[PDB]
């Protein structure tokens, strides 16, 4: 109920969709002065400022990153590495964090909702949704996250389908 | 001592005459060597 | 013994035959040349004529004379009034029977000539006379000195050997002079002690023979009605194409020829010695011939690559000598053999732009091949190591740049040039 | 040895019945048939001199 | 004692080897080949020379008609000519105007000069190499003629030597051979009957003293000139003279491996190809116990001079300490160097100077002195003379002239690349393990 409204209020201005002949196939992320955007989602950036840049690539981590200018670094998402197990907020409701794995109940999940960040009860991004795999009744996510050292860890289960 | 050309008779002074000039009655070699035994 | 081989040509004859050039036009010449065989080396030719040599006109064995027919009757002159020449004058050595031996330079023809009265006899036949040198050095007149090689010249003697020529009966020689006229008749007067046969065709057909009888014919009142031949029975002539042959197929015999070809020794010239200069796997030759001189070179390996060249002017002939041998023959000199050894330009013991040129002048192909493959191996190794270095630097810095904090730790900054 | 001929009578080719300086016209007839004969050379040498 | 060795086929250069029966003194063998022949089986087929056209005398009949008679002479041409009107020296020969008839006849016979000037067409197969050896088995010499087949030994003083078969069946003689004027030509002549005019073989004859000769000389009778008696003919000029003008140089100038083609038996001498193996059967009476010969201890070798030359460009000194004074054999069992000496006379104490010849720029060979083995090591230097007049007294090797500088520039640039690529592999492995190790925490 109110969780989707809080997601729409937090991700209103900072989330920009990716257009491809009128089709919405992905979402970029503006956090820490960086613009995260995946490889398989191909299209034009809806924002005029973020589209006229050059994104350095990382095909192993599956991330394109760039440098957000200084006049927009205050209007970004927050990030942290301290995460316990339990529940977190996602755009279609809730997501479970168990044994270092993000799980989503079934019914939701198609092609197009790639790049949506995972939020917490405070308002900090803990993961970035990149792919998903159907596991019985409860699907698992293939995402990226950080740690205390500062190494971007990409978690990928078996036989995932890119969204 | 023989001559080089295969049909010659050799005088006393080394000069070689033709082989039929040896006993011919006409003096061919110096000191008449060819006409000594005919 | 000497007569033992002269009496065989004592039983033949001389004769007359047709020549082409006999000092005015063509005529029947007593010195008609049958053949000129010139295969001896230092210029010795062996003619065969019609007139005979070394015999007396009556039939005895006179020393140096020539015995020629002259319109049926046989004459003689001393041999030192007979002269012949091919292009320059020749020198008669000796003669025996039909065969003269001479010494001649080269030419297109031979003209044998003499002069008995104030009437000059000649005969020119277009037979090539050639001068054949001995050895690998080509001269026209034999040298004053040199070395002696095996040569083959016509033997000056006259000994019985394998060769024979065949003498046959003469044919009926015709005689216009023998026929004559009475007041109104035709008289055939044979010569002294001589038979003849007469054939006339004025009335019927007449074939008659006389034996030393001056016969008057009553019919046939023209000279041209009668042909008077002459009969020869105790003599031979050579089996020539210039004489008619007698009836009956008897050849009656054959005689051996003088002056055959035998094995002798001839002095050959000797060339000036070359001036031999050496180079690295090379021998140069400065060659100054007197007369033209063959140069024969070959290698002492599996492929000889031989060379053969008649050199006549001063020449310089740079050759290549490998470590397997080389050999030249210059003139009548023996073969000189040469062998190369390992002297390459360069120092094999350091300064790496010198060892490359040493082992390149030593082995040209292997040095290029080895340096090419070593440079390719070194290039692939350096490029692959730099590729793996860039791969590991990307693999180090990829997790640390995707973080929004954008910091690099202390060790991985300087060691990977992260800044 | 070799037997030469002048008629149907064989004789050794070193001892001829006739000589050229005795009868000249008949030695040629003697040397007629004796050409195809291995002893023509000995016959001619014996007919050279007496 | 059975002893087998392998001598290279090249005359003039000495060959040394020693027999090593164990409990006895080593026996030196020195064999120098004087002459090495190669005699093929040679079968005469026909001989050839200049021809000689024999022209028969013209048979003339006045107001008649002659007839042609065959005589079966070689290349015998016969034609009869009518309407001729001949002249002699003493007037006309006939009285008729026409209807006169004349026979021209011609035939080809051998030249008068054939016994001295001719060529011989032969055939070659199945050569037998034959050699002159000068053998020194234990300071005793003999000159020996031996056949190199797999049999035919030679026996002197109980020593038995069998020259093994040549490694190569090469011959400088082809299938067909022409011998002319002492020299031997490698020509391809036509068979007895296939002789064509103008070229070699237009006159053929089975022997020089034969009686039946083939002639194909293209003889054609022409018509005699009006008013003359002669036989005119027209044929091709001689094939033997044309062969003599168009000779290639003989086989003593064009044959490979330095063969020397000699005449009187057809043979090639001193032709350096292949290798001649040997075999010995030595009686035990020529050997000697070791204790009656100088046995040595503590020998050391140093190189005084070392020039990689074709001749003996090396001088080495062996400093020894033997037990008795006498001779003993010296030999290098490898192919690095070749000793000149093969017998060094020793005292009880001193130095021995030997002469070797090598092609290594850095020689290292194991020399055998009397019954021991020393190691001579040095460096050779290049010679200065570019061309010599004697052959090479040793045997070349691969990697023989490679210098220690060249080995350094090979090794430091060829194995150093492998060092760089394996430290690249180790660096990539350490980076992969470190990055995967930091990613295990989550
Ligand atoms: Ca005299």
Overview of the molecule:
The complex is a heteropentamer of chains A (163), B (38), C (419), D (50) and E (442). Chain A has helices at 2-10, 48-51, and strands spanning 17-20, 23-27, 29-31, 34-36, 44-45, 56-58, 63-65, 78-79, 86-90, 93-98, 101-105, 117-118, 124-125, 127-133, 138-145, 153-155, 161-162. Chain A has 163 residues and is mainly β. In chain A, the strands form five sheets. In chain A, strands 9, 10, 11, 12, 14, 15, 16 and 17 form an eight-stranded antiparallel sheet that branches. In chain A, strands 2-1-5 form a three-stranded antiparallel sheet. Chain C has a domain at 3-171 and 255-266: Immunoglobulin-like (Sandwich). Chain C contains four helices and 30 strands. Chain C is rod-shaped and about 165 Å long. Chain C has 419 residues and is mainly beta. Chain C has helices at 7-10, 352-362, 364-401, 410-414, and strands at 17-19, 27-29, 33-37, 44-53, 65-70, 73-78, 83-85, 91-103, 110-115, 120-125, 147-154, 164-168, 173-174, 179-181, 186-188, 195-200, 206-211, 215-217, 226-230, 237-238, 254-256, 261-268, 275-279, 282-287, 293-299, 307-311, 315-316, 319-320, 326-330, 336-340. The termini of chain C are far apart. In chain C, strands 3, 4, 5, 6 and 8 form a five-stranded antiparallel sheet that branches. In chain C, a hairpin with a 4-residue loop joins strand 9 (110-115) and strand 10 (120-125). Chain D is of the alpha+beta class and 50 residues long. Chain D has one domain. In chain D, strand 1 and strand 2 (9-12) form a beta hairpin. Chain D is globular and about 25 Å long. Chain E has 442 residues and is mainly beta. Chain E has a domain at 296-377: Immunoglobulin-like (Sandwich), CATH 2.60.40. Chain E is built from four helices and 32 strands. Chain E has helices at residues 239-245, 251-254, 404-414, 416-438, and strands at 2-8, 15-19, 27-42, 46-48, 51-55, 59-61, 77-82, 87-88, 91-92, 101-110, 119-137, 141-147, 154-156, 159-161, 176-180, 183-185, 203-205, 213-215, 220-221, 233-234, 260-262, 267-269, 275-281, 296-306, 314-322, 326-328, 337-339, 344-346, 350-358, 364-369, 372-377, 387-388. In chain E, strands 2, 3, 4, 11, 12, 15 and 16 form a seven-stranded antiparallel sheet that branches. In chain E, a hairpin with a 2-residue loop joins strand 30 and strand 31. The interface between C and E is large, with 89 and 82 residues. Strand 30 of chain C pairs antiparallel with strand 32 of chain E. Bound molecules: calcium ion. Residues 21, 24, 26-28, 34-35 of chain B line the site of calcium ion.
